[PDB]
Every structure is written in structure tokens, then in C-alpha cells.
Design a protein around this ligand. Sequence first.
Ligand SMILES: N[C@@H](CCC(=O)O)C(=O)O
Ligand SMILES: N[C@@H](CCC(=O)O)C(=O)O
Lengths: 256, 257
Amino acid sequence: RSLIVTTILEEPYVLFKKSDKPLYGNDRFEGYCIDLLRELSTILGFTYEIRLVEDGKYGAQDDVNGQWNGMVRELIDHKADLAVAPLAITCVREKVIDFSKPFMTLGISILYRKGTPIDSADDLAKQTKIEYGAVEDGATMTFFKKSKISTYDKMWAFMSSRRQSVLVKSNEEGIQRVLTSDYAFLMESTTIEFVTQRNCNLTQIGGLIDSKGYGVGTPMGSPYRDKITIAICQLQEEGKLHMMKEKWWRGNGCPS
Amino acid sequence: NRSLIVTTILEEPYVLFKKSDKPLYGNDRFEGYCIDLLRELSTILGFTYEIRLVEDGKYGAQDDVNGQWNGMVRELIDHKADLAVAPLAITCVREKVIDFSKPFMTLGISILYRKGTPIDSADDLAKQTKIEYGAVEDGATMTFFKKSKISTYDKMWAFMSSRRQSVLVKSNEEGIQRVLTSDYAFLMESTTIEFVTQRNCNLTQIGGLIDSKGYGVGTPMGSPYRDKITIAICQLQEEGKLHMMKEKWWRGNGCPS
Ligand SMILES: N[C@@H](CCC(=O)O)C(=O)O
Ligand SMILES: N[C@@H](CCC(=O)O)C(=O)O
């Protein structure tokens, strides 16, 4: 039996492979998470079918009714066996789904343009001329919501009282807003690293604000979770996780 | 309920002896990021505890021949302690014999040497012989190099293993003192490197993180505290408390970097 693997389109983790002819099935995707998924299947010996989350969402809990959406809800309802995606392992998701050990470490940081007085979230928090936000219903947005730290709680009051105007639906939308307006985008440092190598005008501002991991998600209590953690340890041991990251982030396009 | 026995090891700034004129007793002897963490866990979960330094002074690694563990790891396996609240690296070989909470801090292995050196990576360090290098004996960093199949790290282990008696040292403080007085580069965890370099401007990290892992609270295999501790650390992490404690103990922030 074939495991259903739910994912989401996000460069350079998961993308449509470019070719002159129609591609079908798993063959039509490529990226870091497609390579990882492939290495996992050959270690653990399963077959799989990749499907993109119908929602287009990562997975947040809505306050009004306590229900999840996105990739998390797909695993909650057992419509997927695994989620191989840049899905952040967070405490609020660990209550409803299970994660393998992280296959990559990252943090929330700020994507903005080179050449400004802003050099930390602290500088953003204390003003309102430069708008900022994050992907709505992602892990970054939940960081700000739960923090009892002045700077981050103040950034959440700002974003919160301007939801319909400063929260974006995807990273690409946030990236487009940084490039076309006075807007700073809170997003994950791994993605920022990929993005600032293709746009020399963009830069990560300040350091990492938190620290987290991407792990493969599974429904709560499933037995593949421990198998997958052991496969990830082996790939880490062998340097393959590292090789996969140089391959997908290879692009000495801009100066660092 | 009885007090939990917590095993730990002296290591600035995680765990140290409070500075005082008069002598202190029990738990009152210690201070540090870890001791603060322990204190917070105890009130979140409601337990009393007694802190005991690991008898053999090691974090824990496996014997070459029989594969028996030593250090804090071995104390947990043997049930001599209920928890290990220390900068204990969560690693795959350790997870086979003890349980860890979710990590309260992430880090990686890096290199500590003097500023001014042309060495800029472990690959650089492996190809020369004027500069010696090593790690804390019987900890997660030594184990990393010992098990590595990556060419550069395997080359380094061949060196540290042959000069073992001299280059593997008993603690971070001993390795740091070797960096400051001899041509010796020290393989160690980035959090600790960050503590040191912020306070001594003659010292620097060389290269990036050599690998990546977290610190976690160790518990004996299958203990019920594991999930309760994970739950507490999540509370502390979400709200911003771990960050506030990191800032309190990594105080020194004063060098070009
Ligand atoms: N990777 C995030 C989505 C994007 C973000 O929140 O920055 C998640 O797992 O929710
Ligand atoms: N923190 C390490 C010890 C120090 C090191 O290996 O550099 C451990 O848990 O073993």
C-alpha cells in the first residue's frame, strides 16, 4: 500500500519541474522536500503518492470554532499519511499531530530592502510608517500571538489590528510586497536565504528571532513517525541532508 | 511525593557554584541558566528536587569495546537520577538509551580559536599540522567525530584519536584555557562559543556550524516526566521565558563579531 503524502508548493522545497512535455504524478514535482521524500522511501521502503494540500494552507487553528485547516487538518482527518513540506514544528501543532525529529533548523527573521535605519524587530515595533506582517495562519504568525515579550507583543497588536491589510496569503505574496512597497516581511530564515540570493536588493534584517525546526508531520500516534526519525538520523549522519541543502540553495547570485 | 534527584555538571553559564563569602548548602549552592530552568520547571509541574553533580564528571559517551555508557547518560540509564538538567546534547545514539524532552536551546558544533588566524574551516584545520585541535573527552562532540563517515571529520578524528591523551580535555574551561595559551583550536558547542567570544575579544568562532542539534532534559528511558517536561518547556518557550533567561546569562555582549 501507497502512503499519501501531503505537501504545499513552496520554492525551493516543492515546485513544478520544468519540461517541454507533460509530466504525470509524482514526476511533476521537484525540490528539497521531493528529494528528502525520495530518500525516506528508499530507506524505509514505502511507495507514495504526493498530493498538494487542497486548501493551499500550512495549518492554523481558528479561534471561533477551534478547528484546524491546511496540512495539519489533512493529517488530523487521516486524509494523508505524511506531510513533507517546510512545516514548522511548534507546540500548538504538536498537540494535534506528531513530528519526526527536524530535518532542518531555522528561525523567524525579517525580509526587507538593503539600505535603511531598521536593524531589528525592535526598530520595526516602535514605528508605523513601515508596515510589516507575516503569512496569515502560519507558524510565524503564532509566534507573535503567544509571546509575552514587549517587542513581539507590540508587533502582534500592530499586525492584529491591521489583519486585512498587512497579513498575506503566501510567502510569494509577502515577497512581492517587500519589492513593491514599504513593507517588511516576517518569514523563516531558510526561505529568506533562498530569496535574498535571487534579489540583491533584499536582505535579512537582524538575526533570528526564534529557533525552530521543520519536521515530517504524521497523524497523532502513528508508527511511521519513529521510523522516519531514524531515517532522518541516518541521512544526517551521512551528510545527505547537508548535500540536499547545498543543491537546492546553490546560487551564489548575490553578495553575502 | 519525594524529591526528584537531578544530575548535572558544572559548566558556565549553565551551572556554576554561586559566589559567596559564607558556605551554602544543597540547591542553594548553584546558579545558572540551567538552575533557573529547573526552578521554573519545578513550579510549573510542582515537584521538589535535589541537585547532585555527576560523580564521574562526564556528559556521557560509549565504551569502545563493550558499548557501555558513562557520565550523566549512564546515571540516567542506571536510575541514579530522575532528570539531567544540563547542557545535554540530544543525539541519535543517546536517544537509543535515554529519553529527552523537546529542546530548550538549539546549537551546533563549531570551532574556537584565536582571532588573526588564516584557518577558516574544519577542512582548513584538517589539512595542516602546526595547529592541534581537540574536544571535551566523552561528550557529544567527541562522539560526533568518532562516528563520522565524512572525509574531513574522519581525518580530524584520526588526529584526535592518536593524540588523545593530550588533545581531548576534561571540560570546556580546560579547552578554553588551552586555546588562550597555545596553538590549539577547540571543537565545541556554539552556545558556549557565543558565551566566550562575547566576553574575550581575542577569541573567535571559526567557520559555520559543523552540525546542528538541541539541548534537552534527559530522563531515563520511558519515564513519565518526559512528556510533562516537554509540556512545560513549551509553555516557557512560547511565552518568551527561555529567551529572557538566555539574555540574562549570556550577558557579556561586547566584541566585534
Ligand atoms: N513554514 C510555516 C509557513 C510560513 C510562515 O509561517 O512563515 C509553517 O509551517 O506554518
Ligand atoms: N554538551 C556536550 C558536551 C560538550 C561537547 O561535547 O562539546 C554533551 O552533551 O555531551
